[PDB]
């Protein structure tokens, strides 16, 4: 009958500079011979060809497909990806959402700490030097 595909992780949150691996799977009989990945954009969905910008990779086996995205960019990479598997009896699709965390949130306890140190130094340096 018709195939039923599902994502291993429906939503992921990786960070820039790394490489995300989204994977869809299916257990229908007959197995899914071909898989295709599309990136959702406003009013249109663009196919993800292997080797694009030397950073995309697609690895497909019977009923399972991995989408590797290297060097996570903050402008084009985050969003929704659609995997479509077409068995001899039909086709199905799954939706995976990917977010890219930046270094702003990653180096959060570094800026926080140095800011707090600065504030402390200003507080003590005005509370004593001129006020006291």
């Amino acid at each position: 009958g018709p195939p039923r595909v599902k994502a291993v992780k429906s939503s992921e949150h990786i960070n820039e500079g790394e490489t995300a691996m989204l994977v869809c799977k299916s257990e229908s009989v007959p197995p899914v011979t071909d898989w295709a990945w599309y990136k959702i954009t406003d009013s249109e969905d663009k196919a993800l060809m292997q080797g694009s910008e030397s950073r995309f990779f697609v690895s497909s086996s019977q009923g399972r497909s991995e989408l590797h995205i290297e060097n996570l960019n903050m402008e084009a990479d985050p969003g929704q990806y659609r995997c479509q598997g077409t068995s001899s009896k039909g086709s199905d699709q799954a939706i995976i959402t990917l977010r890219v965390r930046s270094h702003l949130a990653a180096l959060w306890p570094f800026l926080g700490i140095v800011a707090e140190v600065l504030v402390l130094v200003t507080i003590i340096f005005i509370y004593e030097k001129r006020r006291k």
Partner: antibody
Amino acid sequence: QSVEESGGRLVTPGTPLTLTCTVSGFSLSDYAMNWVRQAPGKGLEWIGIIYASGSRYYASWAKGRFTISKTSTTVDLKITSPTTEDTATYFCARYYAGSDIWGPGTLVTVSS
Amino acid sequence: ADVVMTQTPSSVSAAVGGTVTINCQASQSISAYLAWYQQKPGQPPKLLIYDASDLASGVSSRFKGSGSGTQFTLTISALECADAATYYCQSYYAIITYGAAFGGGTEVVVKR
């Protein structure tokens, strides 16, 4: 769905050596193959992987020391310069979700 | 940079019928692509769990993988004598960049 390694033997340091893994019950164009080695009484070392499209990726510590290739039915792993520290059992494994199907393994000894 | 897996503890024991746990800690986010393997002495390893939680085909329910992110844990219950073997975890998250390095290993000794 099975595989079978061959080519394990004793060789002198420096002499190259090629191991062959013959698949059976599935095509090499629809599944990837991993090469994993294990020293006597030690853990498993992941060597490299060759995808269905043909791309080959090697471990950081193993860059240059090995070479993976494949034909329509077998995968070959060539060692360009084996050392004494290269004696281990080498397994080939079909990659679908982790390594499910594994081979019996062939033993490669490097000594004088 | 290849991801390194820190498997602890090295050894773990339990009586027949008990429950053991094994923890694997990844050097980086390998959120859900970790497989667990059971290798018996002499025989080749056999895949036990894929995607850190899905049970492999023809595997008993006694094995239960849990965890995500960088911390994973495998647990066995009703420890039979046929469970005495070494267990290994393995990351396979974006192998083309971080490899598929294996864990140190965990020898599970039953206490009869």
